[PDB]
Each structure stands twice: as C-alpha cells, then as structure tokens.
C-alpha cells in the first residue's frame, strides 16, 4: 500500500513551532514524499522559492536514512495559473520544451519523478492534459534507456464530479500514470452559507443537496470512469476548515458569516493545521457526524470541521477494503510534526495512524 505525503515549500516561513523544514520528516513514515510546488518558467520546470535547491537537497538526503524512500516534485499548484498551465500544454512547442526539461531537472536534484498538479483544467483543456500525460510518460520511458530507474509520473485530481467531467479523461490518463492522488477533502464550497464537512466519507442522511460530495462517490466514480483500483490513492486531509458562525445555531444547516479566524501559526482565514486544532479542542464542544464518519468542533462563534485519528484510520480501512493503492496525505507540515501539541508525545499522529492501519491484516 502506498503512503504518499505532501510537503509544502512555504511552511518554512511559519512563526516559531509552525516552521517546518524537510529535516523534521521521519523517513520511514511515508513511501513517497512529494515536494510542492515547482514553477514553470520559459516553458521549463523550475524552482519556486529562493532556496528550493537547498530544501530539495535536505529532502533527498532523507534517502540516506531510508534508501527505499521515493520523492517526487509537484508542478503547478493553485498559486499558479490554470491559464498558465493551459498555455504551455495546448501548444506543441511549449509542451515539448516543458517535457524535455523535466528529467534532467529531476535527475540533478535527486527526485524520483514528477507529480502534475494542474488545478484545474477547463473543458477546452481536457484533450491537452491527455496529450501531456501521454507525451511526458513516453519521455520518461525514453530516458530510462540511459541506465537509471524510470521516473515516476503521477497526478493530482480533484474529487468533485463537475471538475472531473470538465477537465479529466480518466480512462486515458490512468494508463500512463503510476498513480492518481484523488483530492477527497474539498467537498464543501465557499459559496455555501452554512456549516458542513469538507472530507466526509459518506453522504449522510439529513438532506442531500448533493449525494456526490463525499469520498465514496468520488472513488466509485473514478473506478467507473476506468481508473484501476491499483493506481488510485485516496486523499486524506490533515487540516481543518473553520467558519465564523452567524447565530447560536451549531448543528446541521447552521448559518455562517464567513470563514473562521486565522490560526496562530498558519495565519490564513478558513484553515487550521491539526496542531492548531488540538489546541482549539481545549474548551470546545465536540461532535461526530454519524453518517459521514468525521468530526467537528465548536467554541464561541467558531465551528471547525476536521479529521482526527479515529476518522483517518476509518478512511484508511475504507480504502483497504476497496483495494485501492494507498492514501495521500495533505500535508505533513499541517500534521503535528513536532509531536508536542496533541497531548500524547507522538509526532505525525494523523499520518502514523494511517500508516499503522495500512500495515494491518
Ligand atoms: C499561505 C499559507 O500559509 N497558507 C497555506 C495554504 O496555502 C495551504 O493550502 C494550506 C495547506 O497546505 O496551508 C496553509 O498554511
Ligand atoms: C514563476 O515563473 C513565472 C513565469 O516565468 C515568473 O514570471 C514568476 O515570477 C515565477 N514565480 C515565482 C514565485 O518565482
């Protein structure tokens, strides 16, 4: 079973204990660590942060401690034009330039492959996404002739039906990809004027505006679309999402004035790391949606949807039973990586609970 963990570039900048460098990653925790994100510049893969060459190097020396660890570099992200990606892929020359640039860059910096994170193709883009994956793989195949173990190619794929139908020819891209990380934790929109969980496993009985907005739909759907189970990796989040409440109403349907206030360390409205959530729980009322099998918490006018050890293990069982290829965790810097916040003296609590489950019979 694969355990694929994202590491994010910009976590280095967080104040105090929030600051995470690739140092702090336990090298036997994951099977693949993916570094996010790389830029594209002059139609070629490139560094984002001023010091990526160093961080890349810090990450790839984790391989000294664990020679089986695979690392990938992810290109794209959200800070990065979908429009910018589109431009590069929908033209034969710029697509060629990009593709030729990738293996030497990966080889130089000691990575084992590439993760495409185009978020997200438009309906005009679907055809070019397919050509790019195809052509990128054939390039990795042709470079394997020079003696080194073949570069892996993976892709990050949104878990909303609408976005999938729009941008992704799953049947086609699954053939050339080594795995697909399904992004099963963005199921509760911004437009929404109410509380809700963003990574529910099941739909849950109370009312279904969508019966599609849960991990299980998304998984069944990708299988139906023709991704083999053995290339599919289910995304499990390590963060929560917070909402400022609009009234004293707190349960299903409860109205919302907007996103919840910034976390002390992550400093971004609407999101908390798991280590900020562990502290938030002191003084909170906690509940579990029975149907959706994920928890939420609330205190003052703040309401948080999150994943805990129980829920994350539960998702890991689900994927085992479904015979998927593994889990994808977003992200290591948002787990309790110091191991000091969540009571028990355990570093990467969420990610280890998954790993532990992945190893069971
Ligand atoms: C700029 C910033 O600090 N916000 C990041 C956000 O970009 C990222 O999506 C999230 C999960 O990786 O972690 C937050 O801390
Ligand atoms: C990424 O590359 C673009 C296109 O070349 C460039 O103009 C931009 O400044 C780069 N972004 C960063 C953060 O380096």
From Swiss-Prot:
Pfam families membership: Glyco_hydro_18
Tissues where the protein occurs: Detected in mammary gland.
Principal location: secreted
Alphabetized GO MF terms: carbohydrate binding; chitin binding
Matches recorded under Gene3D superfamilies: 3.10.50.10, Glycosidases
Keyword tags: Antimicrobial, Apoptosis, Cytoplasm, Disulfide bond, Endoplasmic reticulum, Glycoprotein, Inflammatory response, Lectin, Secreted, Signal
GO cellular component assignments: cytoplasm; endoplasmic reticulum; extracellular space; perinuclear region of cytoplasm
S-S pairs: 5-30, 278-342
Binding-site list for chitin: 49-50, 76-79, 120, 183-186, 241, 330
CDD domains, per the entry: GH18_chitolectin_chitotriosidase
Subunit structure: Monomer.
Protein name: Chitinase-3-like protein 1
Organism: Bubalus bubalis
Lineage of the organism: Eukaryota, Metazoa, Chordata, Craniata, Vertebrata
């Amino acid at each position: 079973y694969k355990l694929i963990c994202y590491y994010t570039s910009w976590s280095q900048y967080r104040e105090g204990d929030g600051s995470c460098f690739p140092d702090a990653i336990d090298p036997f925790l994951c099977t693949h660590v993916i570094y996010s994100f790389a830029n594209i510049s002059n139609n070629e893969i490139d560094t984002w942060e001023w010091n990526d060459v160093t961080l890349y190097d810090t990450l790839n020396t984790l391989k000294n401690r664990n020679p089986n660890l695979k690392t990938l570099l992810s290109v794209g992200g959200w800070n990065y034009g979908s429009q910018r990606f589109s431009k590069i892929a929908s033209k034969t020359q710029s697509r060629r330039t990009f593709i030729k640039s990738v293996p030497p860059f990966l080889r130089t910096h000691g990575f084992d492959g590439l993760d495409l994170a185009w978020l997200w193709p438009g309906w005009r883009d679907k055809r070019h996404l397919t050509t790019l994956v195809k052509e990128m793989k054939a390039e990795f195949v042709r470079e394997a002739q020079a003696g080194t173990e073949q570069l892996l190619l993976s892709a990050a794929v949104t878990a909303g039906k609408i976005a999938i139908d729009r941008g992704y020819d799953i049947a086609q891209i699954s053939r050339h990809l080594d795995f697909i990380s399904l992004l099963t934790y963005d199921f509760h929109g911004a437009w929404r004027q109410t509380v809700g969980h963003h990574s529910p496993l099941f739909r849950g009985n109370e009312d279904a505006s969508s019966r599609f907005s849960n991990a299980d739909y998304a998984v069944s759907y990708m299988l139906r679309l023709g991704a083999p189970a053995n290339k599919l990796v289910m995304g499990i989040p390590t963060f929560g999402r917070s909402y400022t409440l609009a009234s004293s109403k707190t349960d299903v349907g409860a109205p919302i004035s907007g996103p919840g206030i910034p976390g002390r360390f992550t400093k971004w409205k609407g999101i908390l790391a798991y280590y900020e959530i562990c502290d938030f729980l002191h003084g909170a009322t906690t509940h579990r949606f029975r149907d959706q099998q994920v928890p939420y918490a609330t205190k003052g006018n703040q309401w948080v949807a999150y994943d805990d050890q129980e829920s994350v293990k539960n998702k890991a069982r689900y994927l085992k039973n479904r015979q998927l290829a593994g889990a994808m965790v977003w992200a290591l810097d948002l787990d309790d990586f110091r191991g000091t916040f969540c009571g028990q003296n355990l570093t990467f609590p969420l990610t280890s609970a998954i790993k532990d489950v992945l190893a069971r019979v």
